[PDB]
Amino acid sequence: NAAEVIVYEHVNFGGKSFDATSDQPGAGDNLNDKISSIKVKSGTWRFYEYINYGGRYWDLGPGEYSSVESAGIPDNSISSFRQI
Ligand SMILES: [Mg+2]
Ligand SMILES: [Mg+2]
Ligand code: NI
């Protein structure tokens, strides 16, 4: 199905933003280890600490996560993400 997640460089949806509708083995490339807030628009997404879907991961469905820390995810750590 259609899935969409928006990731942001700074807390409270500030800074550079990327609007993804497909899997991101490099979290784009720009926001690797810079993701600080997230809006999941549709679908369940898995977020990984290392590129190419490696290491610890955390799953999120639709929601506005104004800080990843609040969602139990380490700040500036997400390095890839994909739909699950
Ligand atoms: Mg950041
Ligand atoms: Mg990382
Ligand atoms: Ni900035």
Side-chain angles (χ1 to χ4, degrees):
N1 293 343
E4 184 177 18
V5 61
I6 307 176
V7 293
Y8 291 81
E9 179 185 12
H10 299 310
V11 302
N12 300 313
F13 311 117
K16 294 178 55 170
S17 180
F18 183 65
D19 180 4
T21 51
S22 58
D23 297 347
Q24 299 298 315
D29 284 311
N30 324 279
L31 304 192
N32 180 350
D33 269 9
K34 289 182 175 184
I35 298 171
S36 290
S37 56
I38 302 172
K39 296 176 187 178
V40 179
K41 295 302 200 168
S42 58
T44 309
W45 289 81
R46 183 160 285 176
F47 303 84
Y48 306 82
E49 62 179 333
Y50 306 137
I51 58 166
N52 301 318
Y53 314 128
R56 298 175 291 162
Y57 59 77
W58 305 264
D59 297 340
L60 304 172
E64 309 196 327
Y65 309 87
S66 61
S67 71
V68 292
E69 289 286 350
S70 85
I73 308 179
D75 195 20
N76 298 326
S77 290
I78 299 174
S79 295
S80 54
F81 52 87
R82 68 170 148 189
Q83 182 184 0
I84 55 172

